[PDB]
Short mmCIF file of C-alpha atoms and ligand atoms in Angstrom, two decimals:
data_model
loop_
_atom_site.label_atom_id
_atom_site.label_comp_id
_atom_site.label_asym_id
_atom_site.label_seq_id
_atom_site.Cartn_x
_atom_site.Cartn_y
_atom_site.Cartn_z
CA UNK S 1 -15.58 -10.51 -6.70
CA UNK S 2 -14.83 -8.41 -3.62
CA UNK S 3 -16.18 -8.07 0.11
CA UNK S 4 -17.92 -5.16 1.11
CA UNK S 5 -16.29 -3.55 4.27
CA UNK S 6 -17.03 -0.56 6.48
CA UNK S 7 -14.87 1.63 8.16
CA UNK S 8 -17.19 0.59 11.26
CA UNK S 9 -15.67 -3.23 11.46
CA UNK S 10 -12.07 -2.12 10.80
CA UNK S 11 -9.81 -1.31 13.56
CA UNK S 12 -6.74 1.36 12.61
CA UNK S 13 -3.67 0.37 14.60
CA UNK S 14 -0.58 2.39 12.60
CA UNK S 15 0.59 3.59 9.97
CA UNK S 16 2.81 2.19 7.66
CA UNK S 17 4.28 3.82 5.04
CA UNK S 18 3.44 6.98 2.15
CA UNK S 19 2.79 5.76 -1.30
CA UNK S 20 0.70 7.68 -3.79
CA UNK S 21 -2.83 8.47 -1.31
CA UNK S 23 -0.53 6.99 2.93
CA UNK S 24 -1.00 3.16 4.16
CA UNK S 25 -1.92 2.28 7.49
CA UNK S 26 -2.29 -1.09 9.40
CA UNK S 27 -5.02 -2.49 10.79
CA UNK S 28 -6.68 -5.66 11.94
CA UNK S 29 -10.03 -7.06 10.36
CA UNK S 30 -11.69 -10.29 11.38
CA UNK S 31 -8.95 -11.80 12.86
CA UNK S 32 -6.71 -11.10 10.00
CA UNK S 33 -3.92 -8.30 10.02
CA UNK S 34 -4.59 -5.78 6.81
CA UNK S 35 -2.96 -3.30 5.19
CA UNK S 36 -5.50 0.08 3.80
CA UNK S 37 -4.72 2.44 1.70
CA UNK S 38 -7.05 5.47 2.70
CA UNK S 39 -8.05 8.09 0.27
CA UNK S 40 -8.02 11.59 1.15
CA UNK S 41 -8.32 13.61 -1.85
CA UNK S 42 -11.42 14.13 -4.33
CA UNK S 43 -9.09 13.30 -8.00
CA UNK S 44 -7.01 10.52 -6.10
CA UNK S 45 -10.68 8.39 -6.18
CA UNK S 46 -11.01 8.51 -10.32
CA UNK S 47 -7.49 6.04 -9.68
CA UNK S 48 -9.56 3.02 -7.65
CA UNK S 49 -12.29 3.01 -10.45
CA UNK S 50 -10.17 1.96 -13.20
CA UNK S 51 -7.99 -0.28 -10.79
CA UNK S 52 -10.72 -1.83 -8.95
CA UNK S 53 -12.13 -3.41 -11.53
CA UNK S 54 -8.83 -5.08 -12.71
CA UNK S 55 -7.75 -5.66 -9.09
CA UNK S 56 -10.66 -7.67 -8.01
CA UNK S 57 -10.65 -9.62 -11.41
CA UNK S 58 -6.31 -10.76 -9.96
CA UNK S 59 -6.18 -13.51 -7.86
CA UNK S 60 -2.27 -15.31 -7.36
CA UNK S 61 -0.27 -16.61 -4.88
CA UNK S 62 2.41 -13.91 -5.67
CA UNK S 63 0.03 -10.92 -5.89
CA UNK S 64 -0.98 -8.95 -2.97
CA UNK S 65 -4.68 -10.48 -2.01
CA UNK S 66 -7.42 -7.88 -1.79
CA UNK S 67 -9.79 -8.39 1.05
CA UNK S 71 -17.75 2.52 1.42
CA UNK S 72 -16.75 5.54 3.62
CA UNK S 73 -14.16 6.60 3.77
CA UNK S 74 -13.30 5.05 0.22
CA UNK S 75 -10.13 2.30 1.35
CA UNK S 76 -8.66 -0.82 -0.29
CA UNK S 77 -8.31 -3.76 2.42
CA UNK S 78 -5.55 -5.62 1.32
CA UNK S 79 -3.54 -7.97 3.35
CA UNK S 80 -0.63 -7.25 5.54
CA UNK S 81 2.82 -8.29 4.78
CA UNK S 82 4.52 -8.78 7.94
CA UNK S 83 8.33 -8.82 5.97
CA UNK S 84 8.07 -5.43 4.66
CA UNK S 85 9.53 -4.30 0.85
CA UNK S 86 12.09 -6.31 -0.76
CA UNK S 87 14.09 -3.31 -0.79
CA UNK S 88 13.63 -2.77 3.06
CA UNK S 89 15.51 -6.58 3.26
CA UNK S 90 18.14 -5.20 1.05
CA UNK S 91 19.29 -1.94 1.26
CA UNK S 92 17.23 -0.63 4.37
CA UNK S 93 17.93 0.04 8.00
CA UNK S 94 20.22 -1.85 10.07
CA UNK S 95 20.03 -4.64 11.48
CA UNK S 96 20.29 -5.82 7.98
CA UNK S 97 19.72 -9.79 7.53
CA UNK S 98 21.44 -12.78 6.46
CA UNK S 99 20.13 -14.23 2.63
CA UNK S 100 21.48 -16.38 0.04
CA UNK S 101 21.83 -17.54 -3.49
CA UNK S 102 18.44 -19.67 -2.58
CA UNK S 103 16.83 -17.29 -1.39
CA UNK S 104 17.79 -14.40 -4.38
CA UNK S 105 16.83 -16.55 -7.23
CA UNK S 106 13.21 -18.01 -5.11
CA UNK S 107 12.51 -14.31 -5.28
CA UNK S 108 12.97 -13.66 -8.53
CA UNK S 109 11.27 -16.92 -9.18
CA UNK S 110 8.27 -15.81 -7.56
CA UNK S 111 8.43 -12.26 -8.92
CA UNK S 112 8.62 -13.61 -12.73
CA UNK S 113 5.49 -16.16 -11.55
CA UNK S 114 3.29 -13.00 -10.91
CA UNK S 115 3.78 -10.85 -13.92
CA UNK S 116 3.59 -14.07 -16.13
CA UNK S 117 -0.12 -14.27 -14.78
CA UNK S 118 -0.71 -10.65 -15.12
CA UNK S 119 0.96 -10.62 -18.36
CA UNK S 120 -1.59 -14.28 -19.67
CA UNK S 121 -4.91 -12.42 -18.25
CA UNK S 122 -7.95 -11.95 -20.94
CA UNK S 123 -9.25 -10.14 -22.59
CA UNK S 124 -6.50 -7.86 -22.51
CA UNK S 125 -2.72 -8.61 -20.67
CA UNK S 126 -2.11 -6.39 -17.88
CA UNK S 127 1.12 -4.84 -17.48
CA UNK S 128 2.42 -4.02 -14.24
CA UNK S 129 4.93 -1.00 -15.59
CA UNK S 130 6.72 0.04 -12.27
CA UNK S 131 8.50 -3.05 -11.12
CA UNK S 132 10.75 -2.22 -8.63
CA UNK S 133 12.24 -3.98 -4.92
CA UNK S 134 9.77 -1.19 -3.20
CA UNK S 135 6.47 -2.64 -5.24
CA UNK S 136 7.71 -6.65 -4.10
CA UNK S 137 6.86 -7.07 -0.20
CA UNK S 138 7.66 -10.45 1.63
CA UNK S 139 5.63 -12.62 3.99
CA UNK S 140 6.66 -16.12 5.55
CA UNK S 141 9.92 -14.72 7.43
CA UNK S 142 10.55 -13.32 3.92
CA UNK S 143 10.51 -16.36 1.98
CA UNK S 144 7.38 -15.93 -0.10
CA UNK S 145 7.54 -12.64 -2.09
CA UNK S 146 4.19 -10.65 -3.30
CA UNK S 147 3.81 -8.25 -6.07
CA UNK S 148 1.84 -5.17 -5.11
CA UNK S 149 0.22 -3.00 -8.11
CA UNK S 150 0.56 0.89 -7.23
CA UNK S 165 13.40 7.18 -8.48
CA UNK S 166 11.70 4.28 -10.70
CA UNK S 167 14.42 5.53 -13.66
CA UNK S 168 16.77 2.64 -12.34
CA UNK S 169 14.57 -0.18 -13.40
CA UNK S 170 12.67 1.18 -16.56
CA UNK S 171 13.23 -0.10 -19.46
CA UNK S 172 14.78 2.40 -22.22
CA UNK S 173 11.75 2.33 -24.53
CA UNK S 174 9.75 3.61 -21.88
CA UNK S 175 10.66 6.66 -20.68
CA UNK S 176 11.71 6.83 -24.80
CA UNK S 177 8.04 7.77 -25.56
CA UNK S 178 7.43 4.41 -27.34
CA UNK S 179 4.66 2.37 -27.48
CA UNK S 180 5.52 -0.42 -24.67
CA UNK S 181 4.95 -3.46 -24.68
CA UNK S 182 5.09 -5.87 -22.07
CA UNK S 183 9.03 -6.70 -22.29
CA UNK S 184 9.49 -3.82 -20.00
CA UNK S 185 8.56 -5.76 -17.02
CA UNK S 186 11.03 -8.37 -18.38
CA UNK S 187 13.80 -5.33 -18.35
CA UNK S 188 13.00 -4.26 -15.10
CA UNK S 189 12.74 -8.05 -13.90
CA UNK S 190 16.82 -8.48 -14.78
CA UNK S 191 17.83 -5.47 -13.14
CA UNK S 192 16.41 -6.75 -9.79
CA UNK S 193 18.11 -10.18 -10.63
CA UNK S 194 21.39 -8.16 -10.46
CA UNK S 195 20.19 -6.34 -7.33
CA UNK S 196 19.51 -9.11 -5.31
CA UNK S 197 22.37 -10.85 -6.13
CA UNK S 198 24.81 -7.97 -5.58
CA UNK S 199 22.78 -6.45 -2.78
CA UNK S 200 23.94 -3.36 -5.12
CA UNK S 201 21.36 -0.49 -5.85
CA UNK S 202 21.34 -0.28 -8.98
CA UNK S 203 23.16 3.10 -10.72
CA UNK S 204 24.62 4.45 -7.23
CA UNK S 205 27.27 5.79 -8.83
CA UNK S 206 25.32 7.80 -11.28
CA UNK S 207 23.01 9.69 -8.86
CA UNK S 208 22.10 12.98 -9.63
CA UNK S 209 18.44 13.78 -10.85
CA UNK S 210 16.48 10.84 -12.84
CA UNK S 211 17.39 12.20 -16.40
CA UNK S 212 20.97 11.43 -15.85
CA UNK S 213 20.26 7.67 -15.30
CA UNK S 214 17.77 7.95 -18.34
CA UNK S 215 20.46 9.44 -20.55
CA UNK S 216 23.07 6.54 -19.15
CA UNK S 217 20.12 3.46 -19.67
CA UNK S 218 19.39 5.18 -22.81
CA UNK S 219 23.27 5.16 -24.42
CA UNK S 220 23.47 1.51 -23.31
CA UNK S 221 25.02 1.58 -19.79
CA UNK S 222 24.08 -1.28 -17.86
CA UNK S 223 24.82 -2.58 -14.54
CA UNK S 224 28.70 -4.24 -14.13
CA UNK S 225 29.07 -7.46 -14.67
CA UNK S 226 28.96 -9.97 -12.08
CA UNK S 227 32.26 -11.93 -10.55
CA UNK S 228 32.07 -15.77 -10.72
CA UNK S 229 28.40 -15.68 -12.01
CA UNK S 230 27.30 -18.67 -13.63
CA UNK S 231 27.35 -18.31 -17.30
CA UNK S 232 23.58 -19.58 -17.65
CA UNK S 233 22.67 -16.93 -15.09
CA UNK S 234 24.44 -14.33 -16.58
CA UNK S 235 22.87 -15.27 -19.89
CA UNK S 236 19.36 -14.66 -19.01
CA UNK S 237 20.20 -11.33 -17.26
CA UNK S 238 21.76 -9.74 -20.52
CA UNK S 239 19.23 -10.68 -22.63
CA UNK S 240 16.62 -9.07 -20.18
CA UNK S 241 18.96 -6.12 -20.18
CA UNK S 242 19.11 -5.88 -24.10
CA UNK S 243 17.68 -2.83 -25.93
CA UNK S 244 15.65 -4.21 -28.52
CA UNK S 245 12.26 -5.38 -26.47
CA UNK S 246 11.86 -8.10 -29.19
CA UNK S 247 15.14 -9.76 -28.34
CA UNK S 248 14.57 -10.29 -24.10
CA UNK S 249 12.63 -13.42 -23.51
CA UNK S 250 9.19 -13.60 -22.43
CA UNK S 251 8.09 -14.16 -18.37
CA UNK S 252 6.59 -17.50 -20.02
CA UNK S 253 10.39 -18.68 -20.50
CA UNK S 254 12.35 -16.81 -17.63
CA UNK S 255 9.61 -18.64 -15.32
CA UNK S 256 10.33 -21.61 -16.73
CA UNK S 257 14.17 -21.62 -16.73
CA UNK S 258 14.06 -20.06 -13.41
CA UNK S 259 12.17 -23.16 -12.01
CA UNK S 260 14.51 -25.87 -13.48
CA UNK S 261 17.54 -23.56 -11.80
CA UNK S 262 15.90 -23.99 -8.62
CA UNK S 263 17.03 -27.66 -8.11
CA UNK S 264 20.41 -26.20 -8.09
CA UNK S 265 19.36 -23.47 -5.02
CA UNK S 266 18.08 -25.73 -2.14
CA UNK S 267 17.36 -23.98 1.17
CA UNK S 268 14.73 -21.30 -0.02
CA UNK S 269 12.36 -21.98 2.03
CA UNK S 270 14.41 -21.21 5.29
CA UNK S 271 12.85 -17.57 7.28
CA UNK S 272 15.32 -14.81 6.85
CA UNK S 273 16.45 -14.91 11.08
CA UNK S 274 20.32 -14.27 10.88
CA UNK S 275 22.07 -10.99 11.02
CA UNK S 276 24.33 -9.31 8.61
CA UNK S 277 26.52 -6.29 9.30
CA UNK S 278 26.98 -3.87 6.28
CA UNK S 279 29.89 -3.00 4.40
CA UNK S 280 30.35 -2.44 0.28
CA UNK S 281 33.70 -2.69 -1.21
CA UNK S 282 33.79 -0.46 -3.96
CA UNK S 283 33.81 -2.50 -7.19
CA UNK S 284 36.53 -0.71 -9.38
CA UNK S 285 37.34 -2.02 -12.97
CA UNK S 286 33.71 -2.39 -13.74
CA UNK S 287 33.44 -5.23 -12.09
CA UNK S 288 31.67 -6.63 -8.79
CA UNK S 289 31.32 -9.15 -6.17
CA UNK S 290 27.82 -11.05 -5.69
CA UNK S 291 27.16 -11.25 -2.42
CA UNK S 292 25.21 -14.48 -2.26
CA UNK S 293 27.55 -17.17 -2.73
CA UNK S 294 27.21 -19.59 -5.54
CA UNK S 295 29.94 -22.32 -4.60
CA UNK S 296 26.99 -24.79 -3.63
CA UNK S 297 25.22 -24.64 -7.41
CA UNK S 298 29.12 -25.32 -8.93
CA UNK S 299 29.01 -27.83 -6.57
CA UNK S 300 25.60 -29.60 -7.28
CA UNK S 301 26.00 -28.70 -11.33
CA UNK S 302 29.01 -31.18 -11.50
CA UNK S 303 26.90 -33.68 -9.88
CA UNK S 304 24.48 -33.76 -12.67
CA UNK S 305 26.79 -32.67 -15.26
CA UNK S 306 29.49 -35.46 -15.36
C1 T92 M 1 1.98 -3.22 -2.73
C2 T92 M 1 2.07 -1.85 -3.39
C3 T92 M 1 2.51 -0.83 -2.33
O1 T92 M 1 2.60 0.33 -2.56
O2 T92 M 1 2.81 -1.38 -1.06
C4 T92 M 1 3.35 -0.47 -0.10
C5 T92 M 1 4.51 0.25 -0.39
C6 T92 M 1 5.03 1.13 0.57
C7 T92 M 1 4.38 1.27 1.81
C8 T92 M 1 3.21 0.54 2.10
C9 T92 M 1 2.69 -0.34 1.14
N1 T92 M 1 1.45 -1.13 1.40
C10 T92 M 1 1.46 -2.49 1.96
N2 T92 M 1 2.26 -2.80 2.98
C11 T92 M 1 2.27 -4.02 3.49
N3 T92 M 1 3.15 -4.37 4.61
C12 T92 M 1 4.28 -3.53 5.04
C13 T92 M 1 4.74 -3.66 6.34
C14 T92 M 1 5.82 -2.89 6.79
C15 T92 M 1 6.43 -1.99 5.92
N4 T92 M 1 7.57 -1.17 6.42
C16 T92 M 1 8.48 -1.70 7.40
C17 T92 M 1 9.15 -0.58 8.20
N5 T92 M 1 9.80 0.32 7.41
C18 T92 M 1 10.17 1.30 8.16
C19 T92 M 1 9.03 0.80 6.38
C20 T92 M 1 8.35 -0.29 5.56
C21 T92 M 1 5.98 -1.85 4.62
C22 T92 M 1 4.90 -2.63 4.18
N6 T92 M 1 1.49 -4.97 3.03
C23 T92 M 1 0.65 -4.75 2.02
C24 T92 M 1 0.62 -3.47 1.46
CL1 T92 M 1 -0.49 -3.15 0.11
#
């Protein structure tokens, strides 16, 4: 299921970034890894119930996992977060409506094979841009299991029992995110509750200018409040493939530079900023 490491064969370079337990980099047998030390005695109950289910996960679009001091080898993603690409520091680069919907493609592809695991479906919860890291020049995206108010679903954080459809919530507000390059409820701020409270009374994010109608379709029916009534990762992976023929060019690195600047979107309305003239373009060629 897993290979049996010690600390002895690993070689700490630096450190990454501070999640729940601190990440550091590292290279292993030729092969550049990401650890996640441990360095508390009630963080280590956390890898018992997660190793077992982590070993058991094997996808393209999951994070691939690779003892004293207790670690988790997993593999390094040279690209960073998804939320690094979009929102982090300058230089910021260049993406576009390819390269927005691949991700989202990819993303839906991972928690519809969490979400179709026996005996029981595993649900990743926290789906957010900082959980989806990139490799390939930031072409291939990777979900990673362990402010989240912006993408949970209002059931959630209602005290309800779940269900999976909150990934699917949380999956359409990072469709709007990505194609905006907007983070989503900005203009709220404040402490977490006050995004809860909006999410809760039915404030979503704006609508989108010049977005195709089928796009905008499947985004408010992720968005809707009744779980029952967004669609399944089943059927958003499948209508997110056959919109791919319409998005050529995904598979080009992320290499170009992009300075920053936001117009703010008054009217409750705003800009994408991918550009979607090419799918108008190659939908009338199939359409008519
Ligand atoms: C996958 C779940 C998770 O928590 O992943 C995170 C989140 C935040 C920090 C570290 C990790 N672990 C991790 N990281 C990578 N690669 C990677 C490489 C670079 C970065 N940074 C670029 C520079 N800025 C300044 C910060 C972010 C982040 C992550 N690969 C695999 C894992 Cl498990």
């Amino acid at each position: 299921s897993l290979h049996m490491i010690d600390y002895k064969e690993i070689e700490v370079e630096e450190v990454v970034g501070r999640g729940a337990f601190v990440v550091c980099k590292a290279k292993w047998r030729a092969k550049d890894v990401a650890i996640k030390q441990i360095e508390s005695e009630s963080e280590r109950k956390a890898f018992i119930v997660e190793l077992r289910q982590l070993s058991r996960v094997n996808h393209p679009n999951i994070v691939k996992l690779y003892l004293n001091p207790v670690c988790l080898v997993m593999e390094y993603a040279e690209g960073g977060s998804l939320y690094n690409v979009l929102h982090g520091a300058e230089p910021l680069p260049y993406y576009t409506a390819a390269h927005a919907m691949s991700w989202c493609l990819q993303c839906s592809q991972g928690v519809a094979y969490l979400h179709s695991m026996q005996p029981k479906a595993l649900i990743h919860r926290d789906l957010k841009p900082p959980n989806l890291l990139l490799v390939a020049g930031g072409t291939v995206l990777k979900i990673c299991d362990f402010g989240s108010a912006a993408w949970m679903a209002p059931e959630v954080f209602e005290g309800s029992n779940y269900s999976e459809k909150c990934d699917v919530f949380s999956w359409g507000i990072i469709l709007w995110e990505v194609i905006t390059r907007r983070k989503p409820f900005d203009e709220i701020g404040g402490p977490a509750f006050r995004i809860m409270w909006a999410v809760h009374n039915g404030t979503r994010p704006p609508l989108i200018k010049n977005l195709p109608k089928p796009i905008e379709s499947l985004m408010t029916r992720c968005w809707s409040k009744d779980p029952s009534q967004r669609p399944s990762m089943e059927e958003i992976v499948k209508i997110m493939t056959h919109l791919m023929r319409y998005f050529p060019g995904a598979d080009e690195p992320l290499q170009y530079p992009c300075q920053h600047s936001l117009p703010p979107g008054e009217d409750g309305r705003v800009e994408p900023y991918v550009d979607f003239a090419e799918f108008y373009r190659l939908w009338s060629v199939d359409h008519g």
